[PDB]
Design a protein around this ligand. Structure first.
Ligand SMILES: C[C@@H]1C[C@H]1CNC(=O)[C@@H]1C[C@H]1[C@]12CN(c3ncccn3)C[C@H]1CSC(N)=N2
Length: 393
């Protein structure tokens, strides 16, 4: 049967790119104040700029909202590479290109920050879509999606199609371009090809999953599978890169270098810091390997795999000269906090966050970048034993 798309009202509601984030339009307050909001599956707070900042063109003005409620409590969120801090309250919230509902939700009004807002990103706040366990300051602060489900008939599921262009976008192009879809309350069949395969959500905190096998061009990385999930593996639209635990990163980069050895790149490239450039149109995709992550299936002793191309893990960037060369950064990097399946991974796939059934679905994205010879893939099943043992305790 032909694939019908039954969520037209939400298709194409995102903008952005992997390096700066994908965002959706929201409104807060009465009368509605429009803000662009980063979709972040790796955190659980709805937090919006609420005071001037050099990188904000607008911000939430609580004094202008008749429906604002002050919770008279602060929240401070320091993290590895930045901080956000603010004041808790509630207000009415809508998603214009979302379900036709308005809900009362917690909002952290950000008053101070450090390397949080991104120059030219076009977003003014973040929508943490993960679970209450990791909400700040504590799990009593109900996340937005939990409020949405509790207050409306919206089904307890959302799905993301993040669409990488495969080439750089400036602020102008990125403002005019469709960056993907967030389907609130359903699955839109127009956004993917082939079958959806589901992996269990291991625990409802982050969107935690279990990786059971890794291959580079079909060659097994051959690590103890616990290494792949040390100390967790998560799906995080608020991270650019595929991030891998130190040991796994070292093994993966060794293998990717070996596969790509017909061309030599500086250390700075492999450290994700330095761009590589080729003459227009000549990027040698074929010398770079595909990468497969096998995920625990829903059936006992079954796994499936997702396969990405260099068109996913090489992130398009602009040159210093803004030349006609095609340039990229290596978007795989080291983690000390587990595997992070970030935006560059997610760009390969339509990802279904099936909270109701405690599972995450993957299918090949209708908007993934590929070439005439290779495409991204989601394939199964494989017989895989002792998969629970891959999880870290
Ligand atoms: C793809 C986009 C270009 C990337 C920029 N990403 C971001 O600015 C992300 C929103 C942030 C955070 C908000 N963070 C946090 N940690 C604990 C509790 C609440 N918030 C951590 C911080 C980094 S990782 C993450 N998923 N979310």
């Amino acid at each position: 049967p032909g694939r019908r798309g039954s969520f037209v009202e939400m298709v194409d509601n995102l903008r952005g790119k992997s390096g700066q984030g994908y965002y959706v339009e929201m409104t807060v307050g009465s009368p509605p104040q429009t803000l662009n909001i980063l979709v972040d599956t790796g955190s659980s707070n709805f937090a919006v700029g609420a005071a001037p900042h050099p990188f904000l063109h607008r911000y939430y003005q609580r004094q202008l909202s008749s429906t604002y409620r002050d919770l008279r409590k602060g929240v401070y969120v320091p993290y590895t590479q930045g901080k956000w801090e603010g004041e808790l309250g509630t207000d009415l919230v809508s998603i214009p290109h979302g379900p036709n509902v308005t809900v009362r939700a917690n909002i952290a009004a950000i008053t101070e920050s450090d390397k949080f807002f991104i120059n030219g990103s076009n977003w003014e706040g973040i929508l943490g879509l993960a679970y209450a366990e990791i909400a700040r300051p504590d799990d009593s602060l109900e996340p937005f999606f939990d409020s949405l489900v509790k207050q409306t008939h919206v089904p307890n599921l959302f799905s993301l199609q993040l669409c990488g262009a495969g080439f750089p976008l400036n602020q102008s192009e990125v403002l005019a371009s469709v960056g993907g879809s967030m389907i609130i309350g359903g699955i839109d069949h127009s956004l993917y090809t082939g079958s959806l395969w589901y992996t269990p959500i291991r625990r409802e905190w982050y969107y935690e999953v279990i990786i059971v096998r890794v291959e580079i061009n079909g060659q097994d990385l051959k690590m103890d599978c616990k290494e792949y999930n040390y100390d967790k593996s998560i799906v995080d639209s608020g991270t650019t890169n595929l991030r891998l635990p130190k040991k796994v990163f070292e093994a993966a980069v060794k293998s990717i270098k070996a596969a790509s050895s017909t061309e030599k790149f500086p250390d700075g490239f492999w450290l994700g810091e330095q761009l590589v450039c080729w003459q227009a149109g000549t990027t040698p995709w074929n010398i770079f390997p595909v990468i497969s992550l096998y995920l625990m299936g829903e059936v006992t002793n079954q796994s499936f795999r997702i396969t990405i191309l260099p068109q996913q893990y090489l992130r398009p960037v602009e040159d210093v000269a803004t030349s006609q060369d095609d340039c990229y950064k290596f978007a795989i990097s080291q983690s000390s906090t587990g595997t992070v399946m970030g935006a560059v991974i997610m760009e390969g796939f339509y990802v279904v966050f099936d909270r109701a059934r405690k599972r995450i679905g993957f299918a090949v994205s209708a908007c993934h970048v590929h070439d005439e010879f290779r495409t991204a893939a989601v394939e199964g099943p494989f017989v895989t034993l002792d998969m629970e043992d891959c999880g870290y305790n």
